[PDB]
Design a protein around this ligand. Structure first.
Ligand code: CLA
Ligand code: CLA
Ligand code: CLA
Ligand code: CLA
Ligand code: CLA
Ligand code: CLA
Ligand code: CLA
Ligand code: LHG
Ligand code: 8CT
Ligand code: 8CT
Ligand code: PQN
Ligand code: SF4
Ligand code: SF4
Lengths: 73, 741, 147, 74, 145, 61, 33, 80, 30
């Protein structure tokens, strides 16, 4: 939601990191993307892809995930 | 009775057999029906034990081959001396050894390769050499190109003598097997004559030629102004000026008043402050003492006069409750098998080469070699590689003896038999220790890498964290530092300053300073132990299971060098003692590569450097090793990536050859993997297709093309692997050190 | 003289050596819980676990991630308990897989014998880890290794 | 962009290797010469020698000369 | 080769120094120096004695790929008979070790088959290849831009 | 095909398929593969001789 | 009980419990007559 | 176990029987070859798959073939 | 922005898919 505003400046985050082996330096080093917890920055381009498709809110992505779970079932 | 007996004109010198390749072998004399014959010719060229069953013939062939090798070595030495005389800047280096880079090779200006004639110095441009020949000659007392020309002449004459001796002792007077099987006489003569008289003659040369010439050179006298060695020999007054004890004569020697010679025979230790090398007056005493020791040792064995020992009696007498018969039969094994002797001698020669590398860097023996960093690194790594190869060859020839010349009838309940009978315990225990060392030596590096990458730098195995201090090595270093005056009372300085002491600096450059051991040193030493133990595991397992195993009860029948025993039993690939040598050679490459990398980084980071007017020394890398050598990332970045800059930025310079060889060695190393990862069937089928293409044009060789044998493919892969890896390290080391030194 | 065939059988894959067949070796092995005579498979496991958890507590306590913390000893004990549970699971799966349900009368090579052994090992291991935890928490020498 | 390009090129190479591997498996298992009496497939098998030899020649051609030019420049 | 070409050309264009590629792509030393050596700096500095950053994970995976690649070399160069004669001794040791012969394998421990070893070495080689280049590409691109 | 005659091999599994050899002997006893053919080219196994049937060999001109 | 606790609740499960149980059950299955 | 088979190209040289480290191949009577003998594989359960029989075979492609099949203790040559 | 109720609905759908996956795995194993 904060990437669709300034996509050329915001780094897209893939998912959060929860590793009980990280030290405080590692947590601080990985806390980026404007979030407040260690994260991975996506390199798959799914952000750009979905933005182009027409996804704007997190609710759109959540609805898509629900539909794909239903389709897998 | 030890006596001389020869056969006169056993073989007629004729070219008839030069035109009959494979004559030495019954299977090969027939002719090349396939291309495998070409490779077999070379593979079996020097396997005299497979040409004939005559131990006399094999021994004569070996003797003449040794003469040929000595002639080749003398030609090599004469070439080096002649190049020093004619294509070198040796005189300029003598005038100013700390400013002009030694060089004795010049390239021709053909395709722009004249760039390799770099500005070494002394108005001379050529290829910088890292063999230490200039320092050897300076220590010897050579001060002219005329003397080097005479040295080259002597080398050429000795090469001619050696080749003539080989021909004479094969074709004119070939000694018999009774002559060859004189171990007592052959050891007495070697020990006393060869070694003892060699070091005695060298002590005489050092006392009469090297010592005064080097004394004046260190005093600063010009090489042209220094008198000549024969002048020193005949003018006892001139030598009595430099070493005032020559006015006394040899009366002190013959009266045991040896203290009179303390001026030129002294137990001083340390390094010469001017040259940075060992005291030649210490080396003269060293060699004199060695001559006495060897001449005494060479009087131990019985030859013709009753006095002496018999090695058979000694061996048979040495046995205990855990070893049954003990050393019984070993004398016969060693005087009937050349391969056992070759294995022992190769193992000892390789270990000696390694020891020589270590001792020649911590106690630079030649003048101005310590501050010639390219020479030190090159010699250390070169001798390490020779040692590793010799050890692997010792394993190979132990396996060859086990397959060929081992007889259970003559080896019953002796040490060899008992080793074979409990080989399983040895290999299992060595396997466990190898796994334990691998874990607790490399998993430490992996742990450090993971902690540094997680930011838990306080959980690492470092001097600033959990510590692994080599307390035992530090204790030994302290002992050696304090020994002068305490446990070696009549020695003025420590044997090596590496143990501890003051920095020795020549030309505002460190020659040798204390080497401090910490956590990184502990880790790298235990990794050395791991690699050595794994190499030993491979080689010893192959040697012990050469004859038989639970998998292949009849392996000696297959031989020492066979591809496999088929895809049965699950697959019996690489089961022979040859394939053990193959894998152990891979692992020797690993071991020596780690050792030489350790040497390079440690010496560039904590020993070598330039000393400022403050008395402080700034090293080439500046303490990188202590905090970077504890992680594989540290080795990748601060050693390989950091130090490869010199070799990768060598284009357009006199090290452009090093850059090109870097790339070519990479190419060959990769090219080896084609042979190592592949098999013969694919290539034989590809050759079938290519032969169809050739036949479609109504032509094809009468010698049918065949893919390399399985063993030959493995050998080619290993040879290219070793050449590529060692050449990469060669270019990297030489470029880096010649750029920063 | 000192090395001979095993059990006077020259063709068995073993040798009679001082380490393998000495009087001290035989006495020690025969007196260890795994071999002592009379012990039920449960008592063997009890003794072995008592012995093993005790030394397990130490490495975790003095080299674990929370070793420089106030909770180092409790963390070490809880990691010891976790490893003990994992090893008890290993023992249980090994017992169910290797030994079939035939009854050889609790010889430690039976389903019932191995079940008793693993139960005793778990109990003894947890008990020994707890005992080591108590001793370390109450004795300064053990917390400082003599410093 | 670099990640996506590398990803899809590696996937492409894997898929091509798999396609050829399964062609070979078909030849081993499912090929019926009597059914494929002198059709394109049987002709491929007929002049496999020519195909393989010319492929080897073009490979050697390319390799020799590309590597030679690179080494000349070096 | 394909991805090296793509990545180097695009990196040079992105930084605007396409001349670097145009001039150094003609010899292999150019690739080794101005592409691999030059662009590996941020990746190998992901973590260092002086700290760490987010590229530490990619540096770790870089070394991980190197490790597994070299491990695959084991299976590809060393073949079965050696390991089968070694595992025989290991089985002997386990059977004759007291306090450990109480435990017994249910499947006879054997060395890997020939085809199995080829496959395992190939898998290790491929994983090292892919992970090493993934780390290099992503970390170098992220550290340069 | 007679003795000392050049015959081209027609056995597909043969190393000498569509190759010429010399007939060394023809056994009339009634064995499965009477003719014996000698070749100058050695096979992979190293044998330059083999036994063929009369339908797997054709005389050359 | 918020969603922020789910990572800490699950990662140990998916990474130690699920693998341990799967390995034990698979071991029992593969070694079974 | 491995499947060992013999074909009519057999000439009765017996080298396959003499080369077998186990005892899997034996000579039996035959009329299709001059020697009057043919190889047979009665004890195929003892075969290990070494293919020594295949190596010691002089006929254009082998009269004896070993097809490696299911593995047992004897086939794998496991002394433990 | 994604609520716990939304995550719980997603988890329920995931559980349904897991049950169906187990059913399919059994049917394929047969
Ligand atoms: C959708 C396409 C597809 C399909 C339907 C099949 C189907 C088949 N292939 Mg396959 N194949 C494919 C693509 C495909 N293939 C591709 C792209 C390739 C090229 C790589 C191959 C190459 C190939 C070969 C060479 C062979 C097959 C075989 C087979 C058959 C047996 C499968 C088998 O043994 O599973 C194998 C079961 C597994 C569980 C695979 C284990 C190994 C994989 C690669 C995992 C390794 C990665 C590792 C776990 C990751 C570690 C991560 C790290 C971070 C730690 C089967 C009919 C075999 C056959 O029967 O031939 C007659 C056979 O010999 N295939
Ligand atoms: C991906 C899953 C995963 C998870 C969730 C964890 C979690 C943990 N690891 Mg890590 N670890 C993993 C994978 C994982 N690891 C892998 C793959 C390896 C192999 C390289 C390691 C190797 C490793 C080491 C070498 C160490 C850790 C440690 C730790 C701990 C973090 C540091 C700390 O202060 O805790 C420590 C504080 C504690 C209070 C520990 C309490 C742990 C309880 C007792 C766990 C319960 C276990 C359970 C009952 C077992 C069920 C078995 C069943 C499945 C059969 C934590 C328990 C450190 C540690 O202390 O571990 C004990 C440690 O030293 N891990
Ligand atoms: C055995 C060791 C050895 C080695 C490796 C070399 C190597 C070399 N020598 Mg030689 N050289 C040797 C022994 C050796 N020499 C000896 C024993 C002598 C004394 C007779 C000489 C006398 C000698 C001379 C007089 C010259 C060389 C030159 C050379 C260089 C070019 C040779 C050439 O291109 O020939 C190619 C010839 C073919 C027939 C092919 C080359 C570095 C030349 C040099 O360095 O010029 C700058 C040169 O002029 N050498
Ligand atoms: C084989 C070696 C060797 C040889 C050929 C000579 C040869 C000579 N020595 Mg002797 N010398 C030697 C070893 C040798 N020395 C050693 C090892 C020592 C040390 C103990 C000496 C110590 C020595 C002294 C002190 C003197 C000689 C002298 C001489 C000369 C008269 C004898 C003669 C040139 C005399 C002379 O004139 O020297 C210049 C003399 O005074 N030598
Ligand atoms: C004192 C030293 C010594 C001696 C006298 C021998 C003697 C022998 N060895 Mg050798 N051996 C040695 C050291 C020695 N070895 C060492 C150090 C090793 C370890 C690598 C071995 C390992 C070894 C094995 C594993 C085997 C032998 C065998 C043999 C026998 C036959 C060798 C032959 O025909 O070579 C003829 C010469 C050649 C084939 C040439 C080989 C050279 C290769 C191709 C590399 C050369 C590269 C060169 C340096 C140039 C590189 C630069 C590039 C740019 C061109 C013979 C009894 C064989 C044997 O007994 O079999 C029954 C055998 O299998 N040896
Ligand atoms: C850098 C490593 C390397 C090199 C150079 C080659 C080279 C080759 N491979 Mg490849 N291969 C490699 C690694 C390598 N491979 C690996 C790791 C594997 C996996 C096992 C394979 C597996 C493999 C297979 C399965 C096949 C190939 C094939 C080929 C050929 C491809 C065509 C070609 O480029 O011809 C050009 C030739 C070259 C680039 C090599 C020439 C080298 C120099 C420059 C020539 C001059 C020599 C010089 C004068 C010698 C002086 C030294 C002397 C004094 C000692 C060629 C022989 C195919 C083939 O045979 O096609 C015909 C084939 O079927 N390779
Ligand atoms: C296949 C897609 C996928 C992948 C790769 C991941 C990956 C991850 N999820 Mg999961 N997740 C998924 C789908 C996926 N998720 C879906 C659809 C949901 C909504 C129900 C969730 C809900 C979810 C939560 C709430 C959390 C994670 C977390 C995580 C992380 C640790 C693993 C874990 O705790 O899983 C737990 C997963 C579940 C309890 C339910 C989802 C399980 C999926 C559907 C399994 C799919 C299997 C796949 C299709 C086939 C397997 C192939 C086989 C060869 C192994 C990790 C980054 C945890 C974390 O720490 O994140 C940072 C965390 O807190 N995920
Ligand atoms: C050298 C270290 C010697 C170890 C004691 C060994 C010792 O000195 O034994 C020496 C012992 C003496 O044997 P006898 O007196 O029967 O033989 C005297 C001989 O001179 C005649 O053969 O011989 C053995 O029992 C050999 C057993 C080797 C023992 C194998 C275990 C050691 C393997 C090497 C690993 C050592 C790591 C040690 C740390
Ligand atoms: C081989 C060698 C060479 C040089 C000399 C050296 C001595 C080092 C020697 C080696 C000696 C070695 C390795 C000694 C190691 C000793 C060890 C590990 C001893 C362990 C002792 C264990 C003890 C007390 C355990 C006590 C446990 C207790 C009450 C548990 C009680 C409980 C249980 C079991 C269950 C319910 C709860 C409750 C009541 C608390
Ligand atoms: C359309 C257009 C636009 C711009 C101008 C341009 C001139 C380019 C013009 C024309 C473009 C054209 C003609 C493009 C041509 C592309 C073609 C022909 C691509 C084909 C690639 C072929 C491939 C991979 C083949 C792979 C074959 C495989 C695995 C075979 C495997 C097999 C084997 C080994 C045994 C038998 C079974 C089976 C499965 C067949
Ligand atoms: C490439 C390759 C081949 C094919 C290679 C062959 C047949 C080598 C033939 C090369 C020619 C005849 C050598 C002459 C040309 C060289 C360029 C010159 C250098 C060699 C000399 C110094 C000896 C095999 O036969 C083979 C067999 C077993 C395992 C691996 C492999 C393998 O990898
Ligand atoms: S070797 Fe081939 S031909 Fe000779 S007997 Fe055995 S099978 Fe018959
Ligand atoms: S394979 Fe080995 S065992 Fe089986 S038949 Fe041929 S030779 Fe006898």
């Amino acid at each position: 939601e904060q990437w669709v505003l300034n996509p050329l400046k915001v780094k897209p985050v893939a998912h959060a990191i929860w590793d009980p082996h990280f030290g405080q330096p590692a947590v601080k080093a990985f806390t980026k993307g404007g979030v407040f917890y260690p994260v991975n920055i996506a390199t798959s381009g799914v952000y750009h892809w979905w933005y182009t498709i027409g996804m704007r809110t997190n609710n759109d992505l959540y609805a898509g995930s629900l539909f794909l779970l239903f389709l897998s079932g | 009775k030890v006596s001389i007996t020869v056969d006169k004109d056993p073989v007629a010198t004729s070219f008839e057999k030069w035109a009959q390749p494979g004559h030495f072998s019954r299977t090969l004399a027939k002719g090349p029906k396939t291309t495998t014959w070409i490779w077999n010719l070379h593979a079996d060229a020097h396997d005299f034990d497979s040409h004939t069953s005559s131990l006399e013939d094999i021994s004569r062939k070996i003797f003449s081959a040794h003469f040929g090798q000595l002639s080749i070595i003398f030609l090599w030495l004469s070439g080096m001396y002649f190049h020093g005389a004619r294509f070198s800047n040796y005189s300029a280096w003598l005038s100013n050894p700390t400013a002009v880079k030694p060089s004795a090779q010049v390239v021709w200006p053909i395709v722009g390769q004249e760039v390799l004639n770099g500005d070494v110095g002394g108005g001379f441009q050529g290829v910088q050499i890292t063999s230490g020949f200039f320092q050897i000659w300076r220590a010897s007392g050579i001060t002219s190109e005329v003397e080097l020309y005479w040295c080259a002449l002597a080398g050429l004459l000795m090469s001619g003598l050696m080749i003539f001796a080989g021909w004479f002792h094969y074709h004119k007077a070939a000694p018999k097997l009774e002559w060859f099987q004189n171990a007592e006489s052959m050891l007495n003569h070697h020990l006393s004559g060869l070694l003892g008289l060699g070091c005695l003659s060298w002590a005489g040369h050092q006392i009469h030629v090297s010592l005064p010439i080097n004394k004046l050179l260190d005093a600063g006298v010009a090489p042209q102004e220094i008198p000549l060695p024969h002048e020193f020999l005949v003018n006892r007054d001139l030598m009595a000026q430099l070493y005032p004890s020559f006015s006394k004569g040899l009366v002190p020697f013959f009266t045991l008043n040896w203290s009179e010679y303390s001026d030129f025979l002294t137990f001083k230790g340390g390094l010469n402050p001017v040259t940075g090398g060992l005291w030649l007056s210490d080396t003269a005493h060293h060699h004199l003492a060695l001559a006495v020791l060897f001449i005494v040792a060479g009087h131990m064995y019985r030859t013709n006069w009753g006095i002496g020992h018999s090695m058979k009696e000694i061996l048979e007498a040495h046995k205990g409750p855990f070893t049954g018969e003990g050393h019984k039969g070993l004398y016969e094994v060693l005087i009937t098998s050349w391969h056992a002797q070759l294995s022992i001698n190769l193992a000892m020669l390789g270990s000696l080469s390694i020891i020589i590398a270590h001792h020649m860097y911590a106690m630079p023996p030649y003048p101005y070699i310590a501050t010639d960093y390219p020479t030190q690194l090159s010699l250390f790594t070169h001798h390490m590689w020779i040692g590793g190869f010799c050890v692997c060859g010792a394993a190979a020839h132990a396996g060859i003896f086990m397959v060929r010349d081992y007889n259970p009838a003559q080896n019953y309940n002796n040490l060899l038999d008992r080793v074979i009978r409990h080989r399983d315990a040895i290999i299992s225990h060595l396997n466990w220790i190898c796994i334990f060392l691998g874990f607790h030596s490399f998993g430490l590096y992996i742990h450090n890498d993971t902690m540094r990458a997680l930011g838990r730098t306080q959980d690492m195995f470092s001097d600033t964290a959990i510590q692994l201090k080599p307390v035992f090595a530090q204790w030994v270093q302290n002992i050696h530092t304090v020994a002068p005056g305490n446990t070696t009372p009549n020695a003025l300085a420590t044997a090596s300053y590496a143990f501890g002491g003051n920095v020795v600096s020549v030309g505002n450059k460190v020659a040798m300073m204390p080497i401090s051991l910490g956590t990184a040193d502990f880790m790298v030493h235990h990794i050395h132990a791991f690699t050595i133990h794994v190499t030993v595991l491979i080689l010893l397992k192959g040697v012990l299971f050469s004859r038989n195993s639970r998998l292949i009860p009849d392996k000696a029948n297959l031989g020492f060098r066979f591809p496999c025993d088929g895809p049965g039993r699950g697959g019996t690939c690489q089961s022979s003692a040859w394939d053990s040598v193959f894998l152990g050679l891979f692992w020797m490459y690993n071991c020596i590569s780690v050792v030489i990398f350790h040497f390079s980084w440690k010496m560039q980071s904590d020993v070598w450097g330039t000393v400022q007017a403050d008395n402080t020394v700034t090293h080439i890398t500046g303490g990188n090793f202590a905090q970077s050598a504890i992680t594989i990332n540290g080795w990748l970045r601060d050693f390989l990536w950091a130090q490869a800059s010199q070799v990768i930025q060598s284009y357009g310079s006199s090290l452009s050859a090093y850059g090109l060889i870097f790339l070519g060695a990479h190419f060959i190393w990769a090219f080896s993997l084609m042979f190592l990862f592949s098999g013969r069937g694919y290539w034989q089928e590809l050759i079938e297709s290519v032969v169809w293409a050739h036949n479609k044009l109504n032509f094809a060789p009468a010698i049918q093309p065949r893919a390399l044998s399985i063993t030959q493919g493995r050998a080619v892969g290993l040879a290219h692997y070793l050449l590529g890896g060692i050449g990469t390290t060669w270019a990297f080391f030489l470029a880096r050190i010649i750029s920063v030194g | 003289q000192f090395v001979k065939p095993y059990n006077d059988d020259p063709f068995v894959g073993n040798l009679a050596t001082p380490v393998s067949t000495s009087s001290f070796t035989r006495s020690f092995l025969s007196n260890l819980p795994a071999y002592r005579s009379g012990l039920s498979p449960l008592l063997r496991g009890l003794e072995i676990g008592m012995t093993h958890g005790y030394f397990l507590v130490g490495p975790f306590y003095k080299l674990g991630p929370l070793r420089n913390s106030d909770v180092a000893l409790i963390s070490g004990l809880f990691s010891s308990i976790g490893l003990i549970i994992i090893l008890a699971a290993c023992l249980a799966i090994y017992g169910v897989v290797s030994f079939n349900e035939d009854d050889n009368t609790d010889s430690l090579q039976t389903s019932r014998g191995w079940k008793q052994f693993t139960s005793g090992w778990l109990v003894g291991s947890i008990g020994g880890a707890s005992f080591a935890y108590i001793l370390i928490s109450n004795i300064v020498f053990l917390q400082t290794s003599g410093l | 962009q670099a990640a996506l390009y590398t990803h899809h090129q590696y996937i492409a190479g894997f898929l091509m290797v798999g396609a050829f591997a399964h062609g070979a498996i078909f030849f081993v298992r499912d090929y019926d010469p009597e059914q494929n009496k002198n059709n394109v497939l049987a002709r491929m098998l007929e002049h496999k020698e020519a195909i393989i030899s010319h492929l080897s020649w073009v490979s050697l051609f390319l390799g020799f000369h590309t590597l030679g030019l690179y080494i000349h420049n070096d | 080769w394909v991805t090296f070409y793509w990545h180097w050309k695009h990196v040079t264009i992105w930084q605007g120094n396409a001349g670097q590629f145009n001039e150094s792509s003609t010899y292999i030393m150019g690739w080794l120096r101005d592409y691999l050596w030059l662009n590996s700096s941020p990746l190998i500095n992901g973590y260092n004695p002086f700290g760490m950053n987010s590229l530490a994970v990619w540096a770790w995976m870089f070394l991980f790929g190197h490790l597994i690649w070299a491990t695959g070399f084991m299976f590809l160069i060393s073949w079965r008979g050696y390991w089968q004669e070694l595992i025989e001794t290991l089985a002997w040791a386990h059977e004759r070790t007291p306090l450990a012969n109480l435990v017994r394998w249910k499947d006879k421990p054997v060395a890997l088959s020939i085809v199995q070893a080829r496959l395992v070495g190939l898998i290790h080689f491929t994983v090292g290849y892919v992970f090493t280049y993934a780390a290099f590409v992503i970390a170098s691109t992220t550290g340069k831009f | 095909v007679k003795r000392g005659s050049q015959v081209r091999i027609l056995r597909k599994e043969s190393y000498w398929y569509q190759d010429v050899g010399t007939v060394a002997t023809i056994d009339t006893s009634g064995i499965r593969y009477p003719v014996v053919v000698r070749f100058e080219k050695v096979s992979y196994s190293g044998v330059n001789t083999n036994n063929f049937s009369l339908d797997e060999v054709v005389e050359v001109v | 009980m918020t969603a922020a606790y789910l990572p800490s609740i699950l990662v140990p499960l998916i990474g130690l419990i699920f693998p341990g149980f799967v390995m034990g059950f698979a071991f029992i299955y593969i070694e079974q007559e | 176990s491995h499947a060992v088979k013999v074909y009519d190209t057999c000439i009765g040289c017996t080298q396959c029987v003499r080369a077998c480290p186990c005892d899997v191949l034996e000579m039996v009577s035959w009329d299709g070859c001059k020697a009057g003998q043919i190889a047979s594989a009665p004890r195929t359960e003892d075969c290990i798959g070494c293919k020594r029989c295949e190596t010691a075979c002089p006929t254009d492609f082998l009269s004896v073939r070993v097809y490696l099949g299911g593995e047992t203790t004897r086939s794998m040559g496991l002394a433990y | 922005m994604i609520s716990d109720t939304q995550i719980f609905v997603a988890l329920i759908l995931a559980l349904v898919s897991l049950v169906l996956a187990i059913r399919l795995g059994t049917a394929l194993y047969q």
